[PDB]
Amino acid sequence: QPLHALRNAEKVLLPGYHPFEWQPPLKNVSSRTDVGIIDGLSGLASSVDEYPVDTIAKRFRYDSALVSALMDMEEDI
Amino acid sequence: MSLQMVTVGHNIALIQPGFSLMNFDGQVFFFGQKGWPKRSCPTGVFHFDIKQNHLKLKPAIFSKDSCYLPPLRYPATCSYKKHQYIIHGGKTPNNELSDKIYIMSVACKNNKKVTFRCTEKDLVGDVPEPRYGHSIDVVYSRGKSMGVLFGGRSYMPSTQRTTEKWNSVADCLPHVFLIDFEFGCATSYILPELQDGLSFHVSIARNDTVYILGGHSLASNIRPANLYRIRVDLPLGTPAVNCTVLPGGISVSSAILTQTNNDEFVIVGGYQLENQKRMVCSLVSLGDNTIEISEMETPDWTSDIKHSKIWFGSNMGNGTIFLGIPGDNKSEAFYFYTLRCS
Amino acid sequence: MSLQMVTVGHNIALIQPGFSLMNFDGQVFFFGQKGWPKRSCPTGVFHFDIKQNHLKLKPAIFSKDSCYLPPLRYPATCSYKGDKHQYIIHGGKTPNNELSDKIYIMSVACKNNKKVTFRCTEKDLVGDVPEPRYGHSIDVVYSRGKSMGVLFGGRSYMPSTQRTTEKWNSVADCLPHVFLIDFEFGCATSYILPELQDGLSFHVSIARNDTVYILGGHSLASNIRPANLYRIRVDLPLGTPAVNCTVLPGGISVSSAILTQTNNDEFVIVGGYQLENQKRMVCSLVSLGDNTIEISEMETPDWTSDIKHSKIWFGSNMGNGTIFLGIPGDNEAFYFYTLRCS
Amino acid sequence: KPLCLMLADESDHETLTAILSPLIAEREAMKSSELTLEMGGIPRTFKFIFRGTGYDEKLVREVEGLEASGSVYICTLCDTTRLEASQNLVFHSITRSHAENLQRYEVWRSNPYHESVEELRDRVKGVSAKPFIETVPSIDALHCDIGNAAEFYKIFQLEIGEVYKHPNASKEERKRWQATLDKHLRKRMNLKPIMRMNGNFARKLMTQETVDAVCELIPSEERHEALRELMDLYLKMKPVWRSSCPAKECPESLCQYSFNSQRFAELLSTKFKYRYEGKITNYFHKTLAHVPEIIERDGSIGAWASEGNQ
DNA sequence: GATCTGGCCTGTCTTA
Lengths: 77, 342, 342, 310
Ligand SMILES: [Zn+2]
Fold this sequence. Notes:
Chain A has 2 helices and 3 strands.
C-alpha cells in the first residue's frame, strides 16, 4: 500500500481514537477522549519574567494511553 | 554607577534566578539556592561576602528552636524593626507554592559566626492564597506596624485546574491584605482604584504610604507605567486604607530597588518590552507627601549585558546591587557582576 | 641475578622490539627506534642512560661527513677493535619493510662535556655479496695478525622470481653458507660446509680468537628449534683462507636469546623462546677453555608474576654484564626491567 | 510502551518535577476509580494497581526524598546505618513507605521537638526532601549484579596483591595489579579491559572457571578455597533474585537462601576483614537482608527489573 | 606564646 494508506491506518492504533469513560469522574482531569500528543510543558510560562525554560517535551495523556494499551491486547485477553 | 567583575568559588551552581539576599548588620546573607539542600549545608542559608572582587559562599546553621524552611524561588522579602525579616510565598523545588509565612532573625553571633532563629507564623482570617512574585511592606501609623501584601501570581483554582494545563498561571485579585504580625491575622480590602492583576512590580515603603511601581499583567500582556499611593491609617477602631493614582510612572517589570541615601531610592534593571530590556536607570526622591522620579546618567555597560536576553539580581542593601547574566553551558553557566550607587 | 624496575621519561614510544644497544667506553647508546626520525633527533641515535633506576633517552649528533642511515629493526651487531673501537651493522629492516644490504660502521669522531659526535661511514661489498636479510649474526675473527668477519645465514623474503603479491610478506631461511668479509677492502666470499645442512635464524653466535660458536637457533624450514651447537674454526694464511665446521655434543634449544659477557673468556646467556607457547625461563652459563666448551644451568632468577605469564618479551645487551628487557602492557605500552648478573 | 520524552538533566530537580507533575497527578487521580469500555461489543470493567520498580537507586534517592548513596542511611527499604549494616548483614526488615517519608519530611521541616541538626537527622533517619513520586521498596537486579561484579573484581585485585599481608600499598602497585588481572582475563577468559562495569562482562565474569583462572595468580592455597566457597555461595544465591519464578524454577535455592546468606556474611566477616570491616556497600546489604521478604511479598524479583527501559 | 579549634582541602567510597 502507498504511504498515505499506511499513515491513515496508523490513526487506529494511536491513543485518542476509542471512546471510554471513568465511572467516578477523574478529579482535575478532563473528560474529552480524543487528545493525542499533549505538549510536555503543560502550558508552562515561557516569558522573560518567570524562571527560564530550556527544555522541550512531548507526551500522551495517561488514561488515553492505558485505554490504547488495553485495546491493543483484546485478542490476547 | 560603576560596574565590576566578581568571580565565584566552587559552589557557583547553587545560584539560580530568583534568589533573595538578606542583610543583617552590614552582612549580606544568601538564600534561595537551586535544588534541595545537601550535606554541605543542611539549612541552605549562606554568608554572601565579597573580598577583593571574589565571591565565597560560606554555610550557616540554625538555633535549637528554628524551623528548616524550604528553598523558595520567588518570595516577598521585607525588612522589619529586634531587626528581622519576613518571607511569604514562593516556589519550592517541587514546583509547589507555599502558603506559610516565615520570620528570620539572629540568635547568637560571635567571631563572624551567626546562628539564626527561623520562626514560623500561623496566619488566620482573610489569608492570601499561595503566590509568587508579589511584594509585602510594613507601615508605621500611630506607633503600630502592619504588613501590606499585594499582587502576585498563582495557579488555577483547585476546581478549574486540569492536568492538560497543569502549569498554567494567572494574576491574582487586586485586593489589598493587611497582616498583623502579633496576632497573625489578615484582612481583605477591595479598592475601586485597582482592576488589573499586577505582578513583578516594585514597592517603596514609607511611614504610612507604600508606592507601587511598574509590573506586568497577564490579562493584558502590557507593561503599564503606573504610580500608586496607598496611605494606610491605623486608628483605634478599624484600619482605613485609601488609594490614589499619580502621574509620571515607569513601565518596567522585575526591577531592582535599592537605597543610596535616606528618603531617596534608585531603580535599575528590568524589562521594557518582551524582547527589549531596560538599560537606563531611575532616581526616586521622596518627601513628606510628594514623590519625584528622575533620570540619572546610565552606567558604562559592557558588551555582555547589551546583547544578553535575561538578567537577575537583588539589593545587597549597603548601596550596592548584585547582578548576574547567563553564559555558555557544557563551562560557566552564569556570569555575575556588582553595581555600586553611592 | 637481580631484577629491578626501570622507569622511563617521555619518549617511551620510540622503543620497539628489535632495537640494538651499542656501548662505547662505558656509555651505552640506543639505536633502532620506531618510525622515521622526527625533528627531536634527526640522526636517530640516543644516549641510553640509566640513573637511580630511571631511563632518560636524549638525542645525539653525527659528524660533518657521516651518512644518515635508516633505523633498522634486526641488524647484525658486533664489536671490532683493529686503531679505533667501532661496531659493524649489516642487514636490518627499514621502516618501509624493505631489507637493507649496505654495511654501516659506527665510530666516535669527537666528544666533550659528555657529548659524543659519531662518524657513520658507508661500506659496500664486492664479489659474493649476501642477500639482504635479517635475524642473522656477524662476528669478527683474528688469525695470524689479521682480521676477518664471519656472516652466518639468516632469513629474508622470497627471491625476485617467485615473490607474488598474494604472499608479499613470506619469509624463508637463507642458504646455510659462510661468508668471509674483509673489512679493509670489502671483498666477500661464500663458502660451503657439508656439516651445515639447514638454514638457521635468530641464533646466538659466540666469538673468540679464531673460532665462532653458533649455539641454538630456530629453523623455519621444518619449524623446529634444534639443540646442536657448531664450531666454525677458520684460519688466515698468506693464501686463500680455509673454513671448517664440526658439530659438538651438549646443545641448547633457544631462539631469540640475549647474550652478554661476565668475565674474561666467560659468557652468560639468558632465556629466549623455548617452544611456540612455552617460554624459556632458566638461564645458562657458558665457560670457555682453549679448545673446549662447557654449559651449565645457573640459579633461576626471582622472576615476577607479570613476566611468568607474559607471552612476548624482548631485550638486548648493555655491555657491563647487564641485560635490559621489556614487557608489553596494554592499550605505558611496555614495562622495562633490568638484570645484573655480575 | 513509551509515555513521555523530554530533554532535561536527570539531576535537574525543578524541571523534572515541573514536567512530571501532571503524570503523577493523573496517576494519583485514577488510582481510586474504575474504567469501563466495550471490547468485542461488550462493556467491561477494569481496576489498576500501579507499581514503580524500574528505577535505579540514584533516581530513587532523588524522588523519594533521600540523600546521595555515600551517606550512612544506605538502605531505601530499612532505616539502618552503615555500621549496623556492616556488623549484622542479616536481620533487617523493611519499614520504609511513601507516607512514612512524607511524615519524616514533615517532622524535619516543622521541628516540633526543638532539636539540633544531628538529633533531628537521627529522628528523621535522613529525610530532607519532600517526596513527590510513590515507589515500591524493591531491588533493581541489573544494577545489583553490576555492583556485585564490580565489588568482586575489586576483591580479586586485592587478593592478587596480598593486602591481608601488606596493609599499605602505593598507586603503581595498584596499577600493576589491575593490569596483570586484565591481561590474565584477556588471555584466558577472552575479555577485553573495560572502563565501567558492563552487563555481559558481569555475566561472564561470575563463573567457576573465572575463579580457576584467577587462582593461578595467588600463590597462597587457603585463599583459593576461600574464593571457591565465596563464588559457590554467590552462585547459589543468584537464581533466587534472578529467576522469573523461584517458587517453580528453583525451590531448593529459595528454601536454602537464608542459610546461604548467613554463611556468606560469616565468610565475609571472618576471612575478608581487610576490606569489609566496619563498612559495606548498598547491594551486599540489600541481597543479604531484604531478598526473602521481597520474594514472599511479591513472588518474583527480576521480572520487575529496569532492563526493559535500558 | 605555644595550644588546641575552625575550617578548608582532598583522596576514597558510593551510586551512575
Ligand atoms: Zn536495608
